Short mmCIF file of C-alpha atoms and ligand atoms in Angstrom, two decimals:
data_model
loop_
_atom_site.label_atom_id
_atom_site.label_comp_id
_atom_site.label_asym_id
_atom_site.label_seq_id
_atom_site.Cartn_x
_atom_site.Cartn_y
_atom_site.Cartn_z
CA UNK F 3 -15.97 179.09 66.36
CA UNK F 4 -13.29 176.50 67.14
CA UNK F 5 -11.55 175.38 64.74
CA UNK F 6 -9.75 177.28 61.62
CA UNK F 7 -10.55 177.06 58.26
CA UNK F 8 -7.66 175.10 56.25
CA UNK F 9 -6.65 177.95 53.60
CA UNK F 10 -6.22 180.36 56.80
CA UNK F 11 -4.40 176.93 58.67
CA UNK F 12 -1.79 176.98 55.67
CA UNK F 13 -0.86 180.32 55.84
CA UNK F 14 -0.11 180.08 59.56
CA UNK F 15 1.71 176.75 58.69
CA UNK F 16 3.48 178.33 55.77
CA UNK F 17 4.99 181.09 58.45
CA UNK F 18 5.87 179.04 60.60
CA UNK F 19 3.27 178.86 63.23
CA UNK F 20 2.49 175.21 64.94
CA UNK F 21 -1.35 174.27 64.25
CA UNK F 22 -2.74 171.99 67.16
CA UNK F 23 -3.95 169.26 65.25
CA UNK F 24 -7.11 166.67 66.63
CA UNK F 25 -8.52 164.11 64.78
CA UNK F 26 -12.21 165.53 64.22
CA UNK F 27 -14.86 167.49 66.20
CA UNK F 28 -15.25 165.36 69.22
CA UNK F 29 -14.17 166.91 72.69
CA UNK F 30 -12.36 163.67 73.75
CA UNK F 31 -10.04 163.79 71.45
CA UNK F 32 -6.00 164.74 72.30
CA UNK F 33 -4.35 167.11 70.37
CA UNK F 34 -1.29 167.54 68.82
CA UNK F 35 1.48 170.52 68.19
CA UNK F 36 2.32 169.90 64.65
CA UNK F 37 4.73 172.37 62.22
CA UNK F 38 6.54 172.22 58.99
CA UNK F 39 10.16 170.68 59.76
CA UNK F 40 12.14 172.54 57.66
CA UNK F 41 10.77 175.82 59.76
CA UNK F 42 11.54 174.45 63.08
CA UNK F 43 13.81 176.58 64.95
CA UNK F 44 15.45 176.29 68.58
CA UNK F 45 13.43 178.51 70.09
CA UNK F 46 10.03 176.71 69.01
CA UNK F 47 11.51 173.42 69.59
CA UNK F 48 12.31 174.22 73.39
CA UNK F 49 8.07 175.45 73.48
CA UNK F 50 7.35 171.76 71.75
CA UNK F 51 9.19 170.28 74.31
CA UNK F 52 7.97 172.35 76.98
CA UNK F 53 4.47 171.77 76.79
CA UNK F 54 4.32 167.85 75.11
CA UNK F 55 5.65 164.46 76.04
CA UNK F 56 8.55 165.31 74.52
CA UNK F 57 8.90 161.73 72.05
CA UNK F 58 9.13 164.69 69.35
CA UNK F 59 8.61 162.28 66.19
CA UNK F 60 9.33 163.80 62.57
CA UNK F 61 6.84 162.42 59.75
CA UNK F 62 8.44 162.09 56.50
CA UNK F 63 7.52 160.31 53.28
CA UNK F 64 8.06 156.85 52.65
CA UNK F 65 10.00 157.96 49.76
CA UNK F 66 11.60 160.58 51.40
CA UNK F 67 12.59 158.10 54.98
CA UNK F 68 13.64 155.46 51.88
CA UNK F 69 16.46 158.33 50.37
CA UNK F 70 17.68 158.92 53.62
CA UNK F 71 18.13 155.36 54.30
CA UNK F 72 15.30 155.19 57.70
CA UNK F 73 14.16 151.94 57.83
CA UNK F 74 11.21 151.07 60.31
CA UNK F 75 12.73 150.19 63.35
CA UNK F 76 11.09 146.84 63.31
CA UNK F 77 9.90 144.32 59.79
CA UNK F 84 0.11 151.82 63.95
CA UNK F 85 2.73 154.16 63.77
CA UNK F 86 5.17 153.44 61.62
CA UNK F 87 8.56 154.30 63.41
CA UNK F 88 12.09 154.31 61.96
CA UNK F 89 15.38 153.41 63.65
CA UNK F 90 15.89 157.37 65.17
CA UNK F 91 18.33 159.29 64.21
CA UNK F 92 21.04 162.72 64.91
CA UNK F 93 21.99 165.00 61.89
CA UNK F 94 26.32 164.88 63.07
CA UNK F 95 27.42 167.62 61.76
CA UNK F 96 26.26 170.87 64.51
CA UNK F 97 25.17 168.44 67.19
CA UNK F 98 26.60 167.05 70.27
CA UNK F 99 24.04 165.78 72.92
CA UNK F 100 21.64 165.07 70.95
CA UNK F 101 18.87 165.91 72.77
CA UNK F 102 18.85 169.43 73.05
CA UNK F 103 16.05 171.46 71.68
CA UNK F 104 18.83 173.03 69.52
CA UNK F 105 19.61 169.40 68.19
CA UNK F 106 16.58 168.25 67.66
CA UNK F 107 15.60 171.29 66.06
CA UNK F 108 18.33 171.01 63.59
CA UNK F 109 18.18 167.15 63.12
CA UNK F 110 13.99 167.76 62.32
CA UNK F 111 14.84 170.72 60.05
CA UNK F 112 18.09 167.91 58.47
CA UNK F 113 15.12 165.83 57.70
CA UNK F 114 13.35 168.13 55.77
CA UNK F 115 16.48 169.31 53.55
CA UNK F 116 16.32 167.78 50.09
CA UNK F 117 20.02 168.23 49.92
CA UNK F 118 20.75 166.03 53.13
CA UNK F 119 21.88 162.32 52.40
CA UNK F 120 22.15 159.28 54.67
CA UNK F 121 25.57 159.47 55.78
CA UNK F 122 24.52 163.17 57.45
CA UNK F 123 23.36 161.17 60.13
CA UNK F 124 23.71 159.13 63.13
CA UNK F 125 21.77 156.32 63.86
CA UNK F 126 20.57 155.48 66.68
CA UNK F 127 19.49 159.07 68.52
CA UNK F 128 17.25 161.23 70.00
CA UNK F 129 14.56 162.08 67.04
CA UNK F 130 12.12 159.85 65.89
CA UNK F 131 11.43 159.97 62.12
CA UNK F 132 7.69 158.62 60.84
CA UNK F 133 6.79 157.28 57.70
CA UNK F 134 3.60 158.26 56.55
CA UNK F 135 2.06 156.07 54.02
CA UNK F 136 1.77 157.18 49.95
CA UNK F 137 -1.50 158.97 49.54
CA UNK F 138 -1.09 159.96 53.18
CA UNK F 139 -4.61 161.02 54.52
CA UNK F 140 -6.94 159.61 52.05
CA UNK F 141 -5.20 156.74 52.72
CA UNK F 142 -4.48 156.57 56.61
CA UNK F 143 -6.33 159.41 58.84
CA UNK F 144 -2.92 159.05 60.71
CA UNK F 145 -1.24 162.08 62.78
CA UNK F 146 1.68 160.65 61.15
CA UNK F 147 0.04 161.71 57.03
CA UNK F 148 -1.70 165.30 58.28
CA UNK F 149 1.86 166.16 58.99
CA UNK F 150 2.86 165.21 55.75
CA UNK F 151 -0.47 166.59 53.90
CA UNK F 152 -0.13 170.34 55.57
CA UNK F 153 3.65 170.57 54.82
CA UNK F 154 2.86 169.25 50.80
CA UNK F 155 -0.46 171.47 50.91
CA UNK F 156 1.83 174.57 52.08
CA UNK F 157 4.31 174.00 49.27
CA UNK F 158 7.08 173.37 51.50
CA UNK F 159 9.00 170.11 52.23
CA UNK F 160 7.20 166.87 52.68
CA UNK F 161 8.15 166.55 56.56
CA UNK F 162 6.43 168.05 59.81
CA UNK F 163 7.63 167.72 63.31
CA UNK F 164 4.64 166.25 65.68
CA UNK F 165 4.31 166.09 69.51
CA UNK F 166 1.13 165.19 72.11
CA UNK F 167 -0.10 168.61 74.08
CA UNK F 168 0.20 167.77 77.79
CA UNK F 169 -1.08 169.10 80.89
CA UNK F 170 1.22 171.34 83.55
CA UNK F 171 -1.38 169.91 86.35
CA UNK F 172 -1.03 166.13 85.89
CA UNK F 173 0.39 165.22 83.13
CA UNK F 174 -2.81 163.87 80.99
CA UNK F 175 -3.15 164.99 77.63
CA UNK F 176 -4.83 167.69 76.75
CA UNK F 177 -8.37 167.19 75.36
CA UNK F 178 -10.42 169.77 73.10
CA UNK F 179 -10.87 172.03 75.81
CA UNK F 180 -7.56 172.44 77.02
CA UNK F 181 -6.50 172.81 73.06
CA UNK F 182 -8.58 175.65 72.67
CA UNK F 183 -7.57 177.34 76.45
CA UNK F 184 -4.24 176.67 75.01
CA UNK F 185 -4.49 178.13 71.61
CA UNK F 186 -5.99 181.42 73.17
CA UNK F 187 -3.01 181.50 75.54
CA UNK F 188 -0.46 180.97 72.79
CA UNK F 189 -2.07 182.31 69.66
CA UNK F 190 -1.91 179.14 67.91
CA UNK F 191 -4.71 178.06 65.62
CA UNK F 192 -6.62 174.90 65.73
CA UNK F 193 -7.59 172.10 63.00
CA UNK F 194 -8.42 168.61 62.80
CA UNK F 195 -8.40 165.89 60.24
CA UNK F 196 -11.60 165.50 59.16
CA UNK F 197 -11.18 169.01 58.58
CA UNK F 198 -8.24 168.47 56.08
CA UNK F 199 -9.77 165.29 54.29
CA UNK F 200 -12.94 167.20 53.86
CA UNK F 201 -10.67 170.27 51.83
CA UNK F 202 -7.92 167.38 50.23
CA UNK F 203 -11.38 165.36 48.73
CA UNK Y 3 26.62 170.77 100.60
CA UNK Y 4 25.71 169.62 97.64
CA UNK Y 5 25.87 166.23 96.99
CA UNK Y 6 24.19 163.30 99.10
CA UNK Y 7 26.41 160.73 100.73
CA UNK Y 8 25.86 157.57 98.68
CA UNK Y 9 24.29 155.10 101.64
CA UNK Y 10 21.79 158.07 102.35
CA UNK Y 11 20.78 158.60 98.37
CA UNK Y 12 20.15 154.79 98.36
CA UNK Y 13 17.64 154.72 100.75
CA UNK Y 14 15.82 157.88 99.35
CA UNK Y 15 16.07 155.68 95.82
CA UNK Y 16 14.88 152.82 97.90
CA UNK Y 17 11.75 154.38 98.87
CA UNK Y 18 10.61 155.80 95.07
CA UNK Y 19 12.48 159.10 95.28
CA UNK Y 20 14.17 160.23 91.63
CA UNK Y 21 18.01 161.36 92.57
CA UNK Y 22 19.07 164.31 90.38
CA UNK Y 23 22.51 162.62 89.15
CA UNK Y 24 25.19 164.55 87.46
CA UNK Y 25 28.80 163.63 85.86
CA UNK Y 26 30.99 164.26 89.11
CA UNK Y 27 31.21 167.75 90.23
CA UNK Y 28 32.23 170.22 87.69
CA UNK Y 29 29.28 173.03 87.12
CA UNK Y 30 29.15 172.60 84.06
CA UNK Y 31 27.52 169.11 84.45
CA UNK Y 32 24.11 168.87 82.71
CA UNK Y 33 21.44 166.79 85.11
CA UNK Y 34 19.29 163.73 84.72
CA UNK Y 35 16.63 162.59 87.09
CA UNK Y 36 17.04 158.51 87.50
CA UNK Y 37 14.62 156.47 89.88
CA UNK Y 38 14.12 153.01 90.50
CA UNK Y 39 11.99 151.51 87.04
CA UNK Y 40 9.48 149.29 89.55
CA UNK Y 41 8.67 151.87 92.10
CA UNK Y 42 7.92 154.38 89.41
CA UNK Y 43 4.02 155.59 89.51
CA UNK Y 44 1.54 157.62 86.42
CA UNK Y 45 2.32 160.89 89.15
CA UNK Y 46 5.92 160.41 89.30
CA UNK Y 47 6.05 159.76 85.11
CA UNK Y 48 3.69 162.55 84.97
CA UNK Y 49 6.58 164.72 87.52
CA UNK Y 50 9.47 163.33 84.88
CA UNK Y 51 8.14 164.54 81.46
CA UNK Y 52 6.84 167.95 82.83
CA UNK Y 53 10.66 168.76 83.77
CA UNK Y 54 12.78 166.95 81.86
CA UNK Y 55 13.46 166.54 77.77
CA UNK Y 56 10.61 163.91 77.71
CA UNK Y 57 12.47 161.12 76.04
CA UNK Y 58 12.31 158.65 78.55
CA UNK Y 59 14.44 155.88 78.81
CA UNK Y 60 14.84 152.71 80.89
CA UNK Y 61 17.94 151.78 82.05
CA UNK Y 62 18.00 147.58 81.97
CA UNK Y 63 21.29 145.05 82.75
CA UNK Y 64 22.23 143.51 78.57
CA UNK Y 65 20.80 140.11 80.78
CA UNK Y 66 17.43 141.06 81.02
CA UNK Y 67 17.32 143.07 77.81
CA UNK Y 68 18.05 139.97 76.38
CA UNK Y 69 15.44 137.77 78.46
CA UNK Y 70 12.97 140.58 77.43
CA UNK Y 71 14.00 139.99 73.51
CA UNK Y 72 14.95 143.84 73.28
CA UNK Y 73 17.47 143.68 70.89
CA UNK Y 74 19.82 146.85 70.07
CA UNK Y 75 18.23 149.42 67.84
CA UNK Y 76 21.03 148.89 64.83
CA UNK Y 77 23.90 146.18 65.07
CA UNK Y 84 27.45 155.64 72.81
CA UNK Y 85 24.20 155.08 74.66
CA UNK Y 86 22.78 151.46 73.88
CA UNK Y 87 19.49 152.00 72.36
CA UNK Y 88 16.89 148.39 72.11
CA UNK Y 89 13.87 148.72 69.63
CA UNK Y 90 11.33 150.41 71.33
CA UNK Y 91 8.71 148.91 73.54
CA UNK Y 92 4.90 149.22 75.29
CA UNK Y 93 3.65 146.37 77.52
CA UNK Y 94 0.66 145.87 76.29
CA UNK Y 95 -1.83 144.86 78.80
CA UNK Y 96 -3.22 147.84 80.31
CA UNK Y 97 -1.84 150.22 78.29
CA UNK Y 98 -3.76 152.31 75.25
CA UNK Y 99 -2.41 155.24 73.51
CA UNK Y 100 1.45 154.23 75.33
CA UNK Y 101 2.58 157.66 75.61
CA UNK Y 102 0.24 158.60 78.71
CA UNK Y 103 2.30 159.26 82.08
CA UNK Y 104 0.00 156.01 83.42
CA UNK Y 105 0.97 154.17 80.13
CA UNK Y 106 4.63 155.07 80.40
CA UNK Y 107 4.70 154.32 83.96
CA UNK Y 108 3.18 151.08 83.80
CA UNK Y 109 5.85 150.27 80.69
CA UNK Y 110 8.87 150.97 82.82
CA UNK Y 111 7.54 148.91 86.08
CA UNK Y 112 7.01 146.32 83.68
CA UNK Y 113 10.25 146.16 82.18
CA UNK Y 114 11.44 145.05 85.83
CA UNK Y 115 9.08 142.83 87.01
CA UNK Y 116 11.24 139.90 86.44
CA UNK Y 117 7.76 138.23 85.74
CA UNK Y 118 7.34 139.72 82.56
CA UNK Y 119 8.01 137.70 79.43
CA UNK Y 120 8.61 138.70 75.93
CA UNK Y 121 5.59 138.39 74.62
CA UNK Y 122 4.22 140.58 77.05
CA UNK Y 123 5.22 143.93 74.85
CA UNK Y 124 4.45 145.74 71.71
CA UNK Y 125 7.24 146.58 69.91
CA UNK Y 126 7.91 149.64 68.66
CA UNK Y 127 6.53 151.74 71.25
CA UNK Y 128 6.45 154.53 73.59
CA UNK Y 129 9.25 153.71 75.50
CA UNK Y 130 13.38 153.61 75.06
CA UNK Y 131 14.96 150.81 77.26
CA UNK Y 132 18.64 150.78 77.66
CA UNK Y 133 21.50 148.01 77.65
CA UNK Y 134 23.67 148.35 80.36
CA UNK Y 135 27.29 147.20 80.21
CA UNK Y 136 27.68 144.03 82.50
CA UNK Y 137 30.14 145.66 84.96
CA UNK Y 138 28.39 148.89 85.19
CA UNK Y 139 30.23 152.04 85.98
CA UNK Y 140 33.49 150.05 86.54
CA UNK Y 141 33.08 149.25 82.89
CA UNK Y 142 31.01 152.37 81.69
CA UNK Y 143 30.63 155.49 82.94
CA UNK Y 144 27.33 156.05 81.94
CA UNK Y 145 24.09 157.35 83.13
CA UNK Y 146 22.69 154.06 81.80
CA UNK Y 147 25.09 152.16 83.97
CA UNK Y 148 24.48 154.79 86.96
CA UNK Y 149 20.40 153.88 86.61
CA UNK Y 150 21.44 150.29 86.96
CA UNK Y 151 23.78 150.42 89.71
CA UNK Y 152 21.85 152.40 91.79
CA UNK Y 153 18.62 149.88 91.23
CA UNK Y 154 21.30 147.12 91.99
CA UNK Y 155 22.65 148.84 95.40
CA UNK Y 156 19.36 149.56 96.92
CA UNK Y 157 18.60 145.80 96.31
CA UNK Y 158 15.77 146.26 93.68
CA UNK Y 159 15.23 144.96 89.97
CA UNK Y 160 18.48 145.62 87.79
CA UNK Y 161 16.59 148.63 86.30
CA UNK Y 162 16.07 152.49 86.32
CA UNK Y 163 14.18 154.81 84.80
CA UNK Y 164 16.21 158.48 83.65
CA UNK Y 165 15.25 161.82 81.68
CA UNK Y 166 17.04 165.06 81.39
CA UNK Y 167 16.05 168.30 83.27
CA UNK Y 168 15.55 171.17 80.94
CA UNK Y 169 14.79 174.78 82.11
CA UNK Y 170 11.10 176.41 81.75
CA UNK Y 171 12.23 179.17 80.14
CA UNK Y 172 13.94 178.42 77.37
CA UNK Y 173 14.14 174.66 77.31
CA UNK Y 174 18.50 174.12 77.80
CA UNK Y 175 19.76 171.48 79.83
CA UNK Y 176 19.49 172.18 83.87
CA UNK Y 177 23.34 172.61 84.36
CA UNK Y 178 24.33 172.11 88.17
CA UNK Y 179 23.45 175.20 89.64
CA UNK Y 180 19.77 175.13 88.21
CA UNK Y 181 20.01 171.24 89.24
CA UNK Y 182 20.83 172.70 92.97
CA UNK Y 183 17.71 174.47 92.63
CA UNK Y 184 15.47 172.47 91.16
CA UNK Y 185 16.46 169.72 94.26
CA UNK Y 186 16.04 172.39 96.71
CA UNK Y 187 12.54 173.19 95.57
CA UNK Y 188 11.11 170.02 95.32
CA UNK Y 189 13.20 168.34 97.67
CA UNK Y 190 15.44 165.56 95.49
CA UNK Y 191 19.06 164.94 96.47
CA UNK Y 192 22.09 165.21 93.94
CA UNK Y 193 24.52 162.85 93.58
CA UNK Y 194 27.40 162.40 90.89
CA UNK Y 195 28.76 159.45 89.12
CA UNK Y 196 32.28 160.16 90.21
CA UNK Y 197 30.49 159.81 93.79
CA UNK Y 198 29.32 156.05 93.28
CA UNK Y 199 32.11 154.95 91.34
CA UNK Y 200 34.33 156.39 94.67
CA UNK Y 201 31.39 154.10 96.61
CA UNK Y 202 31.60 150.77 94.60
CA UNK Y 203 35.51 150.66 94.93
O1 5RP S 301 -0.29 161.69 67.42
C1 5RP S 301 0.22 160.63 67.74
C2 5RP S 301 -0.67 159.48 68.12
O2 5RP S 301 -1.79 160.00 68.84
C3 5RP S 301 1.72 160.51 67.78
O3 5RP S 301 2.29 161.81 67.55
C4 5RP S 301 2.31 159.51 66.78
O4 5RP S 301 3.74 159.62 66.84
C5 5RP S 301 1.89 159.70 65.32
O5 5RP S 301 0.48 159.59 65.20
P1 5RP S 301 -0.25 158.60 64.16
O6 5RP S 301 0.06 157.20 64.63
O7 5RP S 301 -1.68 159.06 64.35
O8 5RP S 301 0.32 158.92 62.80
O1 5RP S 302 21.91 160.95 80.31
C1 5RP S 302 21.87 160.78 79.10
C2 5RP S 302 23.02 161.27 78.25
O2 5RP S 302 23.46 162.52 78.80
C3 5RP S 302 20.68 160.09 78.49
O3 5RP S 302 19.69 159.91 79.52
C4 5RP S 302 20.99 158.75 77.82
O4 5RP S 302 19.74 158.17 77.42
C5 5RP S 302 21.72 157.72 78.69
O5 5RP S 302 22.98 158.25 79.09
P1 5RP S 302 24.37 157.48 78.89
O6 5RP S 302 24.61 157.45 77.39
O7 5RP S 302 25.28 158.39 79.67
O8 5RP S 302 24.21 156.11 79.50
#
């Protein structure tokens, strides 16, 4: 009575709908806002924002971060050097931008020089074989959007409280997923249905 | 009536206040909230993300940056590689994790090896010269540290409006100061100052 099952998970993810994503049962754990990039619009990009840190990171393939020429940022979460899709941006930041950089990402039809580097989203690599190989944040992304059909990039951010700050826990996820009609999952979940 | 005379701004920056800073004057201005980097507390990170875009960055002279070994992101704002300081931190991202970061960055006690690289937060090289040089919100962050006669480094994040996530322009920055009592100041303003 907590969590979704991952067929009726997809279908949410598949329409668009953010999933808040924990790593397994326990009620310590923090959960995440994760959605397909390529779906990622202005208007859900501003809620992301809104109710997260805000370090809105964008898991892609290693393959995929490799075509678009994202190296890691240095040679744990594997971080590239960040990026802005030029054309239809200015600041950068704005949820518009980063909605359209994210959703950039996601485009087969992008290439490299579509973007500027350094800027104001972070791109993830998730590793080949993504979570039967690392139970990462970083690979569910990756998993739900290849599971879904769709692109093989998510957009990721860490639920945070209005009160103080701290992040929220299982509790707060499911207060929060009543409030907003958002479904909830978590990995073991997913490696469970992948295995 | 709305901006702060410079001498009085530095002594609210003195004692751990954020200053909303803008541009110069025009309304169109979008604002950023910019504090002193030591004085900055897991409360007043907490304060920053909830109303702001969430990608915060720190503000540092291209002196320490380099005593630090935080080395631009490639080889426009001035990205380094991303950093945590590692001792006392866990997940990096928490307000108390961010916090701690950013006072750490300008504790000029802090060595290298002292960080995790990539991490949770975005330190910035200032130009040596500061706003006579560039006028930046980087250099602003800086100058103002410098002025007040604290650690060559800030602390910024933009404001972004609750209800549907754009960029606090100046009169929602008006506002916003009024409610929670922060003073505006504008770039234009110091630069004026400083000559
Ligand atoms: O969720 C997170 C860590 O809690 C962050 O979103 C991180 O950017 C990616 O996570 P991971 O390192 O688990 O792939
Ligand atoms: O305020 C900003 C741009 O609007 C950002 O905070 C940026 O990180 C630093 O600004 P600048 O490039 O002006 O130094």
């Amino acid at each position: 009575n907590i969590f979704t099952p991952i067929e009726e998970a997809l279908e949410a993810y598949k329409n668009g709908e953010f999933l808040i994503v924990m790593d397994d049962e326990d009620r310590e754990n923090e959960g995440d806002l994760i959605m397909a990039a390529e779906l990622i619009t202005q208007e859900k990009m501003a809620f992301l924002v809104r109710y997260s840190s805000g370090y809105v990171c964008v898991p892609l393939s290693e393959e995929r971060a490799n075509q678009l020429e994202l190296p890691p940022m240095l040679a744990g979460t594997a971080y590239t050097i960040t990026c802005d899709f030029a054309e239809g941006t200015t600041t950068g930041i704005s949820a518009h931008d980063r909605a359209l950089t994210t959703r950039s990402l996601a485009n087969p039809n992008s290439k490299p020089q579509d973007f500027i580097k350094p800027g104001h989203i972070l791109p993830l690599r998730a590793v080949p074989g993504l979570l039967k190989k690392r139970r990462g944040h970083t690979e569910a992304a990756v998993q739900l959007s290849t599971l879904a059909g769709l692109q093989p990039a998510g957009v990721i951010c860490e639920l945070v409280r209005d009160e103080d700050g701290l992040m929220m826990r299982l509790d707060d996820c499911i207060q929060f997923g009543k409030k907003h009609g958002i479904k909830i999952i978590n990995i073991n979940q997913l490696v469970e249905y992948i295995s």
